[PDB]
Amino acid sequence: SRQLVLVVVFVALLLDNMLFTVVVPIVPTFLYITRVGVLFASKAVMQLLVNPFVGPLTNRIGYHIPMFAGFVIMFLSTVMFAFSGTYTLLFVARTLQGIGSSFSSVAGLGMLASVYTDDHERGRAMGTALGGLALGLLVGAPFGSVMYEFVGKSAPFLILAFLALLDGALQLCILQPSKVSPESAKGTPLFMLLKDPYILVAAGSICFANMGVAILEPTLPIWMMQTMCSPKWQLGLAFLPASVSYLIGTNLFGVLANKMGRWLCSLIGMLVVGTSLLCVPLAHNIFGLIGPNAGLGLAIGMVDSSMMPIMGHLVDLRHTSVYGSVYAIADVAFCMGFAIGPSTGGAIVKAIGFPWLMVITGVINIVYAPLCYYLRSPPAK
Amino acid sequence: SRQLVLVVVFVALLLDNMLFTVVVPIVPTFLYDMQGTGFLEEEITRVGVLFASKAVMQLLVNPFVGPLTNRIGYHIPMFAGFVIMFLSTVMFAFSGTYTLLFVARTLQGIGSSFSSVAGLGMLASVYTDDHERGRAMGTALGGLALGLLVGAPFGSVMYEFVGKSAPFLILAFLALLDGALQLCILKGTPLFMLLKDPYILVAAGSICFANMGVAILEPTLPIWMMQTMCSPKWQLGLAFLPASVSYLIGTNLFGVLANKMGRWLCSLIGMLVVGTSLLCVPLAHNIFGLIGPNAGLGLAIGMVDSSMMPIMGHLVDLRHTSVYGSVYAIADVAFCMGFAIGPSTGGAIVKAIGFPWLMVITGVINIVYAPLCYYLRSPP
Ligand SMILES: COC(=O)[C@H]1[C@H]2C[C@@H]3c4[nH]c5cc(OC)ccc5c4CCN3C[C@H]2C[C@@H](OC(=O)c2cc(OC)c(OC)c(OC)c2)[C@@H]1OC
Numbered sequence: 001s002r003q004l005v006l007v008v009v010f011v012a013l014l015l016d017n018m019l020f021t022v023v024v025p026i027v028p029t030f031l032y033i034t035r036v037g038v039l040f041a042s043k044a045v046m047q048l049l050v051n052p053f054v055g056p057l058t059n060r061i062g063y064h065i066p067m068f069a070g071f072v073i074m075f076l077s078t079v080m081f082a083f084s085g086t087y088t089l090l091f092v093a094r095t096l097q098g099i100g101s102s103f104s105s106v107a108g109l110g111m112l113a114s115v116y117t118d119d120h121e122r123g124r125a126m127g128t129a130l131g132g133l134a135l136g137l138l139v140g141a142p143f144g145s146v147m148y149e150f151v152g153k154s155a156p157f158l159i160l161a162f163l164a165l166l167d168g169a170l171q172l173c174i175l176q177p178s179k180v181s182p183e184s185a186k187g188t189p190l191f192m193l194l195k196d197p198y199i200l201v202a203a204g205s206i207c208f209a210n211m212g213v214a215i216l217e218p219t220l221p222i223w224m225m226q227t228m229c230s231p232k233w234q235l236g237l238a239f240l241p242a243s244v245s246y247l248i249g250t251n252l253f254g255v256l257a258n259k260m261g262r263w264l265c266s267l268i269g270m271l272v273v274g275t276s277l278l279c280v281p282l283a284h285n286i287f288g289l290i291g292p293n294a295g296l297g298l299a300i301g302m303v304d305s306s307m308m309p310i311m312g313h314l315v316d317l318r319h320t321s322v323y324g325s326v327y328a329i330a331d332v333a334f335c336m337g338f339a340i341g342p343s344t345g346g347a348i349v350k351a352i353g354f355p356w357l358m359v360i361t362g363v364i365n366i367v368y369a370p371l372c373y374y375l376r377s378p379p380a381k
Numbered sequence: 382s383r384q385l386v387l388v389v390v391f392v393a394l395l396l397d398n399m400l401f402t403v404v405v406p407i408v409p410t411f412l413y414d415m416q417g418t419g420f421l422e423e424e425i426t427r428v429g430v431l432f433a434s435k436a437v438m439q440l441l442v443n444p445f446v447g448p449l450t451n452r453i454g455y456h457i458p459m460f461a462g463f464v465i466m467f468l469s470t471v472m473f474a475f476s477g478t479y480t481l482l483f484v485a486r487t488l489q490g491i492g493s494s495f496s497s498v499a500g501l502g503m504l505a506s507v508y509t510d511d512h513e514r515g516r517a518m519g520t521a522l523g524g525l526a527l528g529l530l531v532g533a534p535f536g537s538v539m540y541e542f543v544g545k546s547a548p549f550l551i552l553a554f555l556a557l558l559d560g561a562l563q564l565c566i567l568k569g570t571p572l573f574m575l576l577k578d579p580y581i582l583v584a585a586g587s588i589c590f591a592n593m594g595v596a597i598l599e600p601t602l603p604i605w606m607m608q609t610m611c612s613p614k615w616q617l618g619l620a621f622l623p624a625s626v627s628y629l630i631g632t633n634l635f636g637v638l639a640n641k642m643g644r645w646l647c648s649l650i651g652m653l654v655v656g657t658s659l660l661c662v663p664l665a666h667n668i669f670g671l672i673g674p675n676a677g678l679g680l681a682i683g684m685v686d687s688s689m690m691p692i693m694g695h696l697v698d699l700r701h702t703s704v705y706g707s708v709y710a711i712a713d714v715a716f717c718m719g720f721a722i723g724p725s726t727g728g729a730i731v732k733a734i735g736f737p738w739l740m741v742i743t744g745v746i747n748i749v750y751a752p753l754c755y756y757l758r759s760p761p
Contacts (some may be wrong), residue, residue, distance in 0.1 A: 209571070264661070267657065268657070271657075274752075275646075275650070275653075278649075278752075278755060279646065362752070364751050365748055366748060366751060369748060370656070370744065373660060373741070
């Protein structure tokens with residue numbers, strides 16, 4: 001094992017989100033705005049479409065085979081990135097990274113849900129898994145930055161590949177993905193899960209918080225150059241507090257959510273993220289963003305740790321104990337924000353403006369915040 | 382004398398707040414006295430309409446009090462306040478019928494309006510140094526908070542130990558002491574013009590919606606309390622004690638601290654905390670579960686009251702010509718609106734749907750209105 005498959009998911013999410021973030025400081029320097037924006041969103045769009053095809057499959061194949069597929073797909077994704085020097089290869093490698101990320105994330109979260117049956121222990125495990133994901137997001141970009149600065153471009157991809165082989169050796173050691181074991185219980189269909197307001201409310205809260213982070217992610221530096229006229233070295237330093245607060249919140253609230261009540265934690269988290277998004281566009285220097293960005297990260301960790309086990313609790317309370325479809329919906333809500341963010345952020349900012357855009361983000365978060373009371377006590381079947 | 386006028390206005394404001402706070406755990410207890418049976422569902426709407434009468438009459442009487450104060454000075458209008466306060470105090474003690482309580486509430490409202498206007502006018506006229514007026518108004522307004530702290534447990538502690546009429550007799554006797562002291566005694570931008578711009582209307586709406594939580598929690602919390610957890614009759618006054626104590630700590634601390642972090646952020650946080658506290662209030666299964674949500678509601682209401690009053694002052698000073706009671710006059714419209722609309726709609730809501738749905742609606746209203754305080758910052 002119960003605790004044995006926790007490091008396999010921790011390591012698997014650590015490297016996958018490492019490849020997601022390490023690509024940032026190395027790609028646009030090689031090619032030298034809207035043309036590169038579609039490249040960053042290739043992972044989100046393709047992985048969004050492949051998400052509905054991974055959920056229903058898990059009822060018969062199992063979780064081990066998707067995890068091994070995520071390992072191998074990350075292997076090709078890092079090896080192609082290490083050697084690619086053209087857009088036509090970079091887009092294909094990024095799409096492979098996206099599909100591998102979707103496979104590995106869905107399989108890992110499903111395996112974590114299936115391994116732990118107690119509610120509090122499952123919440124703690126999901127908190128530590130999201131902590132590993134936040135740690136990977138924190139360590140990705142500076143790692144590639146220093147590698148491309150002193151050592152070279154292909155070196156970080158090779159190092160991530162070596163770590164990937166080590167992770168795959170771990171998977172072969174513990175999981176043993178050699179046989180197809182179908183789950184005895186037949187999972188509920190994915191379309192029927194969209195007719196349950198509990199799952200829709202939880203997925204909407206997760207998607208709205210992740211959209212609130214993924215909109216501020218790509219368009220913040222453009223506003224920084226347009227208004228503050230700041231040096232380039234602290235562009236990642238501005239978003240560093242968001243990652244650090246994300247890691248701290250997801251590591252600390254995994255035990256606190258059970259005691260404080262999940263619905264109250266989700267409500268307070270979305271209120272905090274709405275207030276932080278409101279307060280972000282009023283800063284006039286880099287020092288004013290450490291507060292609101294840290295609050296945004298803490299609120300996102302609040303919502304994630306509160307509503308990741310709430311999907312499993314709802315599925316156990318109402319439907320059968322097959323966790324693939326609900327967490328597939330959760331991953332879709334996770335990744336549609338990253339699909340919407342970098343492609344359309346510049347267009348929306350040029351159309352309406354950045355402070356207005358954060359106004360709608362905070363307003364929608366605050367207005368949908370009272371809807372989290374519905375999850376206080378979903379009646380059983 | 383300077384001390385005499387200050388003590389007169391302080392005891393008058395305290396008496397008004399005490400009479401407001403002392404009827405909360407007495408009216409439902411009497412109406413039950415005529416656990417047990419849940420027959421109060423048929424009378425909840427009448428209980429709310431009795432509470433709304435004072436606010437309705439006060440809202441009707443605020444525009445009128447100005448001309449009489451201008452024509453015939455200030456001391457004569459204040460004398461009517463004490464006598465009507467005496468009549469309301471005696472009538473509340475000797476009341477036995479539902480009809481008489483409405484008359485007592487209406488007289489209490491008219492006396493409160495007359496006493497407030499006359500006392501603040503006399504305090505403004507007596508002190509003319511332009512600097513001690515702030516301290517005098519501060520102590521006069523803090524008398525209301527002290528009376529609010531002392532009044533709520535008083536009514537629910539003297540009813541079951543001494544008698545129903547005893548707190549009303551003591552309040553009337555306290556009012557009578559000022560009569561001997563009161564016996565030995567001796568312009569622009571009207572309110573309807575000030576409410577036109579949206580910066581002041583949003584402020585008044587924010588204050589009214591923040592106080593509407595306690596306004597709706599007054600008439601229906603005791604009935605729900607006896608219906609659902611069967612506590613003895615002397616916990617009802619103590620249950621609202623956290624709602625006052627947390628209000629005092631909130632108003633002091635955030636009057637100290639709000640200007641550093643921003644007035645609009647404090648208002649938004651207070652509105653959100655009001656919404657979450659009202660949402661978490663009806664989930665308690667015992668009296669000990671209410672010290673948390675009530676304390677949070679009091680703290681958030683203190684946040685809103687301490688943060689939005691300076692915003693109203695700056696807004697009224699920036700564009701229009703203000704007087705000493707300009708912020709008081711606009712603020713009094715918000716509290717009167719809230720107290721008039723709260724219980725009357727709340728009783729109908731608890732009759733039509735369940736009691737927790739009323740708190741759900743008020744919390745949702747507070748949460749959706751909390752974004753609208755963003756407009757107040759950097760006014761033109
Ligand atoms: C009845 O007592 C009041 O009516 C006062 C309070 C209203 C409300 C309240 N009622 C309760 C009754 C309870 O019994 C069960 C228990 C708890 C509460 C609470 C807790 C929360 N609480 C807050 C109190 C607010 C007070 O009003 C001001 O503080 C004020 C200050 C000013 O100076 C800045 C003004 O001028 C600008 C001004 O303009 C008119 C008003 C208000 O009137 C004086």
